[PDB]
Design a protein around this ligand. Structure first.
Ligand SMILES: [Mn+3]
Ligand SMILES: [Mn+3]
Length: 197
């Protein structure tokens, strides 16, 4: 029996924390070798020093999944790929299903206190300004569904947008957390360019 579910109700509203720009600080860090075979990927995680950026990378990968490989690999240490829909957490609104019910952000996290956290990941091959635009596009994509459902349980909407030299996010990230996202993105780009052949 979970006593945190017995609290007075929180304000039912949508919270969006402000987007911040983060720069990576990877510097001259070893990047693991990879071997691609017809795909399977063996990543030489033995080459990394204990605790350096990249410690979340697993040595073996299997890859219909090629188009989203860069996205899924970059954020794989934070969330596995999902098809969890708004409707699985909230049910339909106004007694009629619509397109918003079947949107699927990267994460929908429910807490005992009754808040819901919606998290969306995205990438860009451009610069930091491109990453900010990508983050704002994902806010635009999910803001209507999150606002409407905040009437049921309060929602906070979080975005992580990665580029080659940093992250735009409204999470409060450490240098090491920024570096892990960027490090994985850079490696995913290297692998993807060879996979596309
Ligand atoms: Mn997704
Ligand atoms: Mn995404």
């Amino acid at each position: 029996e979970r006593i945190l579910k017995k609290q007075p109700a929180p304000v039912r509203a949508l919270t969006i924390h402000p987007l911040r720009r983060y720069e990576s600080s990877i510097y001259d860090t070893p990047i693991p070798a990879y071997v691609i075979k017809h795909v399977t990927i063996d990543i030489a995680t033995s080459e990394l020093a204990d605790g350096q950026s990249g410690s979340t990378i697993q040595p073996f990968e299997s890859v219909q999944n090629l188009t989203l490989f860069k996205h899924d690999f970059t954020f794989g240490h934070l969330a596995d790929t999902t098809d969890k829909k708004f409707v699985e957490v909230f049910g339909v609104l106004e007694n009629r299903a619509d397109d918003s019910d079947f949107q699927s952000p990267d994460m929908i996290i429910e807490t005992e206190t009754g808040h819901v956290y919606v998290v969306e990941f995205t990438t860009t091959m451009g610069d930091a300004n491109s990453a900010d635009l990508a983050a704002r596009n994902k806010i635009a994509k999910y803001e209507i569904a999150c606002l409407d459902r905040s009437a049921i349980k309060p929602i906070s909407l979080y975005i992580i947008a990665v580029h080659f030299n940093g992250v735009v996010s409204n999470l409060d990230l450490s240098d090491e957390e920024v570096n892990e996202i960027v490090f994985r993105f850079r490696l995913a780009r290297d692998i993807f360019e060879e996979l596309r052949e």
